[PDB]
Design a protein around this ligand. Structure first.
Ligand SMILES: *[C@@H]1O[C@H](CO)[C@@H](O[C@@H]2O[C@H](CO)[C@@H](O[C@@H]3O[C@H](CO)[C@@H](O[C@@H]4O[C@H](CO)[C@@H](O)[C@H](O)[C@H]4NC(C)=O)[C@H](O)[C@H]3NC(C)=O)[C@H](O)[C@H]2NC(C)=O)[C@H](O)[C@H]1NC(C)=O
Ligand SMILES: *[C@@H]1O[C@H](CO)[C@@H](O[C@@H]2O[C@H](CO)[C@@H](O[C@@H]3O[C@H](CO)[C@@H](O)[C@H](O)[C@H]3NC(C)=O)[C@H](O)[C@H]2NC(C)=O)[C@H](O)[C@H]1NC(C)=O
Ligand SMILES: *[C@@H]1O[C@H](CO)[C@@H](O[C@@H]2O[C@H](CO)[C@@H](O)[C@H](O)[C@H]2NC(C)=O)[C@H](O)[C@H]1NC(C)=O
Ligand SMILES: *[C@@H]1O[C@H](CO)[C@@H](O[C@@H]2O[C@H](CO)[C@@H](O)[C@H](O)[C@H]2NC(C)=O)[C@H](O)[C@H]1NC(C)=O
Ligand SMILES: *[C@@H]1O[C@H](CO)[C@@H](O[C@@H]2O[C@H](CO)[C@@H](O)[C@H](O)[C@H]2NC(C)=O)[C@H](O)[C@H]1NC(C)=O
Ligand SMILES: [Ca+2]
Ligand SMILES: [Ca+2]
Lengths: 48, 48, 26, 708, 136
């Protein structure tokens, strides 16, 4: 349950492909969508 | 909640460690006691 | 989940990787 | 029409595949680098672009291109499924161009976001592409009907902070989706509702009213405790005001809030029992309030429910209400399919001023046999073909009239389709505050507004009638410094079948024109031996108007190149036969002969005169002959005869006209060039009146100083 | 423009109806920092005598104006400008960047127009289940 998409709108992994837009102040830029795991997670007893 | 209850609606969003509701207030107080990021919370209180 | 290099506030904890940096950017 | 029929049939024949072999769909994507030297279901095309002067860009006729916006993935299942059934449109795209070679663009906007235009050209060349075919004005026009929109913004303590900024941006963007045919007013309500701007009832969604509403919503504040029962009772009253002008259909209310607990059943049961007013509810921002009531209001009152959690969702969640609005025109069958032309706007692919005809496409899977109607109430997309204003100007020749005569056409909203003072620039909206998507809508009365006559004429042409009106008017000079009180004759007639109304303005002295004779091959010889580059020494520097005479002949900005090309053309062929404009060339050479005879016989007798600096002559027929050699460099006038301010000024005056020079300008002042005085040449062939030329004098400043 | 050089005499000429003025708005114009206002002057009395007194700044300057018959020029001769001080309030004729007409007054008296008559806004066969709340 510690999987997140670089674009928060796309909930599932199959959706997280292509390019998405960032709206930061006084600019509009486009970056890749990436399906990533959080840096600290709970996947096995060692990671926990 | 009396001092900072209604003034964490900043232009960048409401912080998770807000004093809006009671369950949110308890966690913010608990976090300060453990000492993690108590200065960042204080910065929000001063800015508010 | 704000992107890297976007203005950030540490209390938000919304930064995608790591945390909000000293200079105020992810 | 035929494109829509083919698209409907092919989409009806399609199968919903959900598995592609990574190479099954083939297209161009119109946005990839031409040299990658290197996808989930697609195989790219490397096309060949040569050139085309008809477009200015580099085009390929072998296939159509596809534009998929940055936000949307290029390899999702729905996109690939559309690519298959839209690959069939390429043959019809080719066929239509084969029938009529003059077609510029043939675009198919899709409900999913991709667009296919036939002439394959790369997308436009800070380079983040924000284009979305579902937001362009032609798509919005063809996807629904004119609306009566009342945005009901919610101001309250809760919406303070980020939610207020998101509401501001969302209101601005959704305002950007309206058109001239649509009426909009923005309201707000904390505890008692009030209008956000000076407007009180409803205003047409012009380019000015929209700006006023945007400023008013950008100057908004959040206070108080929300009361829905007053805001809705206010909106419903402003949607019942019939004292003013409105589209009178598609009455729709937009509620921009975050969330609450009141559903206000009594207000809806009081105002909207027959369900004639749609309600769309938007839950803006990231919050934890109860969104249940607003969904219920969107369900009971015919509508749909949206959510905007961040800036990146504003565009999509504000451009979707047209999908709901287009259901009744889908269910109308083959009766809502009428070609409807948009306003004049700048093409997205750098083509200038164009207008677009739009035709919706319906989803007709399972139409022949009566099973499927679940999703058959949404449009597939809107077709579109672009016709440039240059073609329409070509259909209305203006070289048989005087420079003071012209055509103009008006749509039912009053905006000009053709007019000499219409230029390819966006319409100004106000003073430029310190620190290309909008239509070019210029009203007819923004040429020279006259209360008595040019208002009734405009109202008659808008109504779709024909008549004539001769009256004494005021005309503004081309240099925008002088005004003449001339006599003009407005004649208008409707363009039947469409809604535009064409008119022709003609002064009294322009009721006749000189048509040149065929003459003979000998006349061509010595009428051409006058304007040679080495020959304008004893005849004075000779100009020529860049009017297209021959198809091979090319217009050039520099006059010397055009003069040389004209000389070589008239030498190398006869004028009339090689599919050229016989009348234009014949009249140009007739003017050349007349002017050469004049300059030689009269001006050559007196080489120098005490008070004159240059003797010039300009004739209707695109030739100008400044007699002094050194004075030819000071001629700053337009080589085109029909665009000379002094020529048009002198035509309207029965006496001598003095043209004041320019002050504090980088060009030569009135001390080495002189003061320009011009007189209009007047002739009486038979009893008729004609003014085919204007002559003049450049007065020496020092001589007149010592004479004064 | 003679308004820039001698504003008082130009204003007096306009007041005694020598140069008529009436202005237009240019919407397709560019500005350095846009709607632009324009002004043009012309004749409106087609007569010749045109004699009056300025009474400018308690230093009256008698002026005589005659128009050349065949040309479109006018000869105006004033007593002096520098000797008699007056207000300047320069009368510019050049295009100036300014806001257009007030939109509120304009929409109070809208121009004539004919909207499209075809409209499809309701139909009993339309399905209303796609509300958006249950679909997400
Ligand atoms: C024009 O209208 C026609 C019908 O009027 C329409 O064709 C229909 O398209 C839909 C897809 O949008 C097909 O839907 C089928 O339904 C199944 C079951 O739901 C889907 O399989 C999963 O569905 C879930 C959600 O239910 C979703 O995650 C995803 O769609 C699927 N998930 C996975 C893991 O596969 C399929 O989408 C689909 N089934 C199959 C076997 O493909 C209808 O079947 C289509 N109906 C007909 C008669 O063809 C068409 O799209 C409309 N035109 C346009 C341009 O949209
Ligand atoms: C979307 O992709 C589809 C999958 O490739 C394309 O559909 C395939 O097109 C083929 C033509 O190149 C068909 O092959 C022919 O089909 C006929 C059916 O009548 C049969 O005789 C043979 O299978 C074959 N005949 C010949 C002489 O090659 C495929 O049947 C067809 N379907 C598949 C492969 O499932 C579509 O063309 C493409 N979308 C569009 C709009 O073209
Ligand atoms: C303008 O709209 C109003 C209501 O929106 C109409 O109502 C009338 O208002 C005038 C104003 O004094 C009065 O005659 C009455 O208050 C109203 N008359 C009724 C309700 O019959 C008004 O009629 C509209 N304007 C015109 C010219 O009809
Ligand atoms: C457009 O078509 C209409 C027909 O609907 C034309 O109106 C008719 O014109 C003919 C002569 O051309 C008259 O004899 C008829 O009496 C007209 N019918 C009317 C006025 O109802 C109209 O002239 C056409 N216009 C153009 C510009 O072609
Ligand atoms: C626009 O300019 C014209 C040019 O003179 C004006 O026409 C005259 O204006 C004066 C007063 O300004 C009136 O006394 C005359 O009767 C007008 N002449 C005619 C034929 O009407 C005009 O008034 C100016 N203003 C407008 C709004 O058009
Ligand atoms: Ca610690
Ligand atoms: Ca509230």
């Amino acid at each position: 349950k510690f999987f997140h998409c670089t674009d928060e709108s796309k909930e599932f992994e199959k959706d997280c492909r292509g390019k998405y837009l960032l709206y930061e102040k006084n600019e509009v830029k486009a970056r890749d969508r990436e399906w990533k795991k959080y840096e600290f997670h709970y996947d096995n007893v060692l990671w926990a | 909640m009396q001092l900072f209850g209604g003034q964490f609606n900043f232009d960048e969003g409401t912080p998770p460690t807000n004093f809006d509701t009671f369950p949110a207030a308890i966690m913010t107080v608990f976090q300060i006691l453990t000492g993690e990021d108590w200065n960042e919370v204080m910065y929000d209180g001063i800015k508010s | 989940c704000k992107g890297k290099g976007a203005p950030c506030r540490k209390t938000m904890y919304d930064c995608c990787s790591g945390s909000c940096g000293r200079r105020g950017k992810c | 029409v035929r494109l829509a029929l083919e698209a409907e049939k092919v989409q009806a024949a399609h199968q919903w595949r959900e598995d592609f072999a990574s190479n099954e769909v083939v297209y161009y994507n119109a946005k990839d680098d031409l040299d990658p030297e290197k996808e989930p279901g697609s195989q790219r095309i490397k096309p060949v672009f040569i050139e085309d002067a008809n477009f200015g860009r580099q085009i390929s006729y072998q296939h159509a291109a596809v534009h998929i916006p940055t936000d949307i993935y290029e390899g999702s299942t729905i996109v690939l499924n559309e690519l298959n059934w839209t690959s069939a449109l390429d043959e019809v795209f080719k066929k239509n161009r084969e029938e009529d070679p003059s077609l510029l663009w043939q675009v198919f906007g899709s409900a999913t976001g991709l667009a296919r235009y036939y002439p394959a050209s790369p997308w436009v060349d800070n380079k983040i592409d924000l284009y979305d075919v579902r937001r362009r004005p032609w798509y919005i026009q063809g996807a629904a009907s004119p609306k009566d929109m009342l945005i009901l913004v919610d101001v309250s303590g809760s919406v303070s902070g980020l939610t207020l900024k998101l509401i501001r941006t969302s209101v601005s963007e959704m305002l950007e989706t309206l058109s001239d045919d649509d009426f909009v007013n923005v309201a707000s309500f904390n505890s008692n509702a009030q209008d956000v701007s000076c407007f009180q009832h409803l205003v047409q969604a012009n380019v000015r009213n929209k700006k006023v509403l945007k400023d008013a919503v950008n100057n908004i504040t959040a206070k108080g405790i929300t009361d829905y029962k007053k805001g809705f009772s206010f909106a419903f009253e402003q949607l019942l005001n019939y004292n003013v002008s409105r589209a009178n259909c598609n009455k729709i209310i937009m509620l921009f809030t975050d969330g609450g607990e009141e559903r206000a059943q009594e207000i809806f049961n009081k105002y909207n029992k027959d369900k004639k007013v749609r309600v769309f509810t938007f839950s803006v921002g990231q919050h934890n309030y109860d969104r249940g009531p607003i969904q219920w209001m969107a369900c009971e009152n015919k509508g749909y429910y949206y959510e905007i959690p961040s800036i990146g969702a504003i565009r999509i969640n504000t451009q979707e209400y047209l999908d709901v609005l287009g259901r009744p025109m889908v269910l109308a069958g083959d009766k809502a399919k009428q070609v409807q032309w948009t306003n004049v706007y700048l093409d997205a692919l750098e083509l200038g001023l164009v207008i677009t005809g739009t035709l919706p496409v319906f989803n007709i899977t399972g139409q022949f046999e009566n099973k499927t109607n679940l999703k058959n109430q949404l449009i597939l997309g809107v077709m579109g073909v672009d016709v440039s204003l240059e073609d329409i100007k070509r259909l209305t020749p203006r070289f048989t009239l005087c420079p003071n005569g012209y055509y103009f056409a008006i749509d039912p909203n009053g905006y000009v389709l053709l007019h000499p003072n219409l230029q390819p620039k966006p319409i100004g909206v106000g003073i430029p505050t310190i620190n290309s998507q909008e239509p070019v809508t210029l009203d007819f009365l923004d040429a020279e507004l006259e209360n008595d006559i040019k208002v009734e004429i405009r109202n008659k042409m808008i109504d779709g009638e024909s008549g004539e009106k001769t009256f004494r008017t005021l005309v503004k000079s081309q240099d925008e410094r002088y005004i003449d009180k001339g006599n003009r004759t407005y004649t208008w007639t409707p363009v039947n079948g469409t809604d535009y109304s064409l008119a022709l303005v003609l002064p009294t002295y322009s009721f006749y024109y000189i048509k040149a004779k065929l003459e003979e091959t000998i006349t061509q010889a010595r009428y051409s031996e006058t304007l040679k580059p080495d020959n304008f020494e004893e005849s004075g520097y000779t100009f020529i108007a860049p009017r297209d005479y021959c198809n091979d002949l090319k217009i050039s900005d520099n006059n010397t190149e055009f003069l040389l090309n004209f000389n070589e053309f008239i030498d190398r062929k006869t004028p009339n036969n090689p599919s050229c404009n016989a009348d234009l060339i014949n009249r140009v050479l007739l003017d050349a002969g007349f002017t050469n005879e004049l300059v030689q016989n009269y001006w050559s007798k007196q080489k120098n005169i005490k008070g004159v600096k240059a003797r010039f002559v300009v004739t209707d027929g695109g030739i100008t002959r400044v007699y002094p050699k050194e004075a030819g460099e000071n001629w700053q006038e337009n080589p085109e005869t029909y665009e000379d301010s002094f020529y048009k000024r002198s035509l309207d005056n029965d006496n001598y006209v003095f043209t004041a020079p320019y002050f504090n300008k980088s060009g030569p002042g009135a001390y080495e060039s002189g003061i320009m005085v011009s007189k209009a040449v007047e002739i009486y062939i038979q009893g008729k009146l004609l003014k085919p030329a204007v002559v003049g004098i450049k007065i020496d400043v020092n001589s007149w100083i010592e004479n004064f | 423009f003679f308004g820039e050089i001698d504003p008082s005499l130009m204003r007096h000429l306009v007041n005694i109806s020598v140069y008529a003025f009436n202005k237009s708005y240019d919407y397709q114009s560019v500005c350095e920092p846009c709607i632009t206002e324009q002004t043009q002057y012309f004749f409106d009395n087609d007569s010749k005598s045109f004699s009056g007194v300025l009474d400018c700044g308690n230093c009256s300057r008698i002026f005589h104006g005659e128009k050349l018959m065949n040309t479109n020029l006018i000869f105006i001769m004033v007593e002096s400008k520098g000797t008699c001080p007056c207000d300047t309030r320069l009368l510019i004729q050049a295009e100036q960047t300014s806001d257009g007409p007030n939109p509120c007054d304009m929409v109070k008296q809208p121009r004539y127009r004919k909207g499209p008559d075809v409209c499809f806004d309701n139909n009993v066969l339309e399905d209303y289940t796609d509300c958006g709340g249950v679909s997400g």
